[model samples]
Target: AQLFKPLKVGRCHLQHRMIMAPTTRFRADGQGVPLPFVQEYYGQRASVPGTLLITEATDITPKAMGYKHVPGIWSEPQREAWREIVSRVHSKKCFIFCQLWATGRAADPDVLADMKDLISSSAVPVEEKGPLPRALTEDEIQQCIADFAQAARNAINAGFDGVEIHGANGYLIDQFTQKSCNHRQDRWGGSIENRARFAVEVTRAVIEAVGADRVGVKLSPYSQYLGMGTMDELVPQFEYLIAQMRRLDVAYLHLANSRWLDEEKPHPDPNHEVFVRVWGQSSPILLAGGYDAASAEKVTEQMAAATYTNVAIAFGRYFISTPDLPFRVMAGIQLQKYDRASFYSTLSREGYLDYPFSAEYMALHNFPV
Candidate 1:
């Protein structure tokens, strides 16, 4: 099956195409360091060998965040925890990427009230009643670009195979990319290229910090998850953004094709495919957003037909429940459903760990079958 075939992402040679998409599990400590159980959580999934796991989005800097119990890469303590996580993944001969994140206007003012640094491309609140964010000043914009680069360096030093910039789902970069949020007249907004400047520049800075091959970007042009009304310049904006990535020649382009704010069935938007066209069919693209094993199999098959080269499917929720997802998928085993309630239990292992590996897989690994 093409889904089980080999592929190369960044410098890591993957044995299969099922990637663990970056899901915000909120398992980190209040101090923003990943907990001890995280080692087992990631290691279990990576035990399949050659699996590509993108870790939960982690803050680039303290001021770049607005959430608690999410990991950060800036501090020594945080990176030390990540270092162990990377070693665990490497122990199983799998590859992992650290997804660098920022809050921008998505900041929860209440969480980081001390910092009071909720800033975005403009002074736009995600929703009408959402917390109002201050527009980033020119100096602050430069600081953000620098922080992204530093975070990429931090992840690499922590032994990550690569780094992914979460430029999707109405985070900081998305706040800049969408017209619905960015209402600035400066160089960062007012037109498609200007609006896309932040995402492109951030990608460029990260690529420069850690080489282009070691960076991949995720984008959600049509998602209205955080008051990004819709792609006002949808096509032109993303076309330019993806075009820049193509020109930069990064590791991959990850597209979120569905809206998954609260975790229900996907109302997939076909606009995702158009960017696949804009990205040029030969470029590497990873599609992740509510694809079941069977659906991913068919979707992946379609990409391999033509007009596409190296394509992979990333599973978030499924990967949470099925640590042996690739094995179950290849062996035609039934998948266990994940508990959504515990997706963000903050510090518990109820849904984070304890998802049983199938007897078939455990036995194959000589685990007392």
Candidate 2:
């Protein structure tokens, strides 16, 4: 595996195939700015050769936050704080993208209530009997799109290399994309094409704010997390969605993990070809779903020969525990075990920076304990 070969992603040259997964660290403060150690945490991972960092999902608007301690890109101070994070990541020569996110009913209604905002989408709740969100007025829906575009502008202003529109894992965009979640009769719902309107519009708007070459979208057709709608529904709908995105000529289209957690085997979905064919050597197609070294290599070969020119692999948990994951994976070394308990813990160094390199590195160089 010549993993060191250079692969071009838009304007950035990726030194290897590993992508820093977008895992929620919950390390941000009340206003959703990273803590002081944030620089050190990301800087260490970025220092790993050939790593392209995709930061954790940051809220695009106040209503977009689904968790209490998550980060947001809505305010001025938040962007200013992230400017430092960007500088640190760049200091290590790592390309980074800000994941723009908006959670509809996935967010707690109680939290929204406290903020005087109600859970909303197409006048329908998450499922047939989930949180009863106040349907967003047409004006509000417009504002959400504007908010996403503005977030892209903010990311550019903050000096990020690009922006990733979080359209996966049953968030606001996914809600609008699926008929089971969005029952609106307006332009944003009904047929699959209309349902995909919001995501497409948001993509176009973001591209307008920042060039199309600096924008990408992530989608999980079978994630099933947080009461996500059925994959059966996503199969047909994703065809139209992919076509629309391909028409826009985005920089990359990210496919999320379908079977990253290993109790069950991954199921093949129709969207796989949708990405492969639509992307078709024009843009980078990044796939991530329980990918290992062998599988990634095989897919990378097929994609390089036929359609996609580059692929993205996420190893956040492993990277969290092993700062030198790219080298370890390249060297055929055992991966450091991750602690599930500390995955989202608020502690500074315990889960954040405590993961060590291989014992051989330790023995040879006296690496930090």
Candidate 3:
């Protein structure tokens, strides 16, 4: 099967096609350092050699903190802690990418109470109630770009193979791209190209930090979560954004499934075909959202070859429970079920590292099965 053949993603060649999507577990320390068991968690995921794993969305600056237990890459102590995780993941003969992120308007005031202001591309609130945020001044916008660039450097310094710009899921960059949130009249908004400027600039800055080949961008043009409702201009806006990524020629453009709106369904979106066409085959595209063995293989082969060109799958929830995901997919083994309850237990290791591998997989690896 083509899924089992070697393929190139970013600067690394994968022995197979399954890529672990960036997932949030909220288990880091209050200081943003990864917990000790987090290392073992990744080590378990890297059971198969040449695996490509993207770390959970990580803070790019102190001002980016929206939650208490998420990881960060902006400080020396933080990087030192991440250095250990990256080194451990790398030791398994695999590649890992750090996903750079900022919460922007998504920040919860109570959790981030020490913050001066809740800033965004515009003075908008996800809900109709109060707790409004102020629009980011042009100067503050430049600072956000600089913060992303610096975080990219810090990720590389921590021994990560590359950095994935977290421009998806109604975060800072997504807030700027989607018209439902950004009502700015400045150069950063007002039209499709203007709305796309923030993401384009962030990509350029991150590319300049570590080189374009080592950069990947995650974009959620259809997600409704975090208050990013759909719009008539949604397709055009994301098409323009994808066109920019094509021009920059970054390692890849990761797209979250529009079906993600349901959160429980994995049906493929026919709407994404337009983006698949716009983003030709110059670079690979990574599709994320609850993909299984058969469906993933279809996209990796049939859907990819028939239209989207080169494509790969990024598994999240199931990948977390089934550490040896690719192996099971290839062998048709029954995958383990994940418990959402433990997904966000900070400072705990119950569901993080206790997932078991099959006896066949165990017999082949050095670690006990």
Best by lDDT: 1
Cα lDDT of model 3 overall? 0.85
Model 3 misses residue 230 by how many Å?
A: 1.6
Alpha-carbon runs more than 4 Å astray in model 2: 113-116, 229-233, 259-266, 269-271, 305-307, 359-369
Model 2: per-residue Cα lDDT over 177-228, one tens digit each: 8876778888888888888989999898899999988898889866766556
- Model 2 clashing residue pairs (backbone): none
TM-score for each prediction?
Answer: 0.95, 0.90, 0.94
**What does each candidate score in C-alpha RMSD?**
2.3, 3.0, 2.3
Evaluated against the true structure, the overall lDDT of model 2 is 0.76
Q: Give the better candidate number (1 or 3) by lDDT.
A: 1
User: Which of the predicted structures, 2 or 3, would earn the higher TM-score when compared with the native?
Assistant: 3
For candidate 3, the clash count comes to: 0
Better of 1 and 3 by TM-score: 1
The reply for model 1, stretches above 4 Å from the true place, is 260-271, 367-369
lDDT of 3 by residue, 1-369 (tens): 767777788889888878999988887988888887889988889978898999999998877788888999998889998999989888898889999989888887877755456888988888886578789999999999999999999999899989999998888999999898898999999899999999999999999999998999998777788878476788889889999999998998888853346747553463366787788866788888757788788777886567554787888888888999988988888777778775655567777777899777877766653
Candidate 1 residues 48-162, lDDT tens each? 7889999999999987777898999999999999999999999999999999989888777888766457788887786785767888898988999999999999999999999
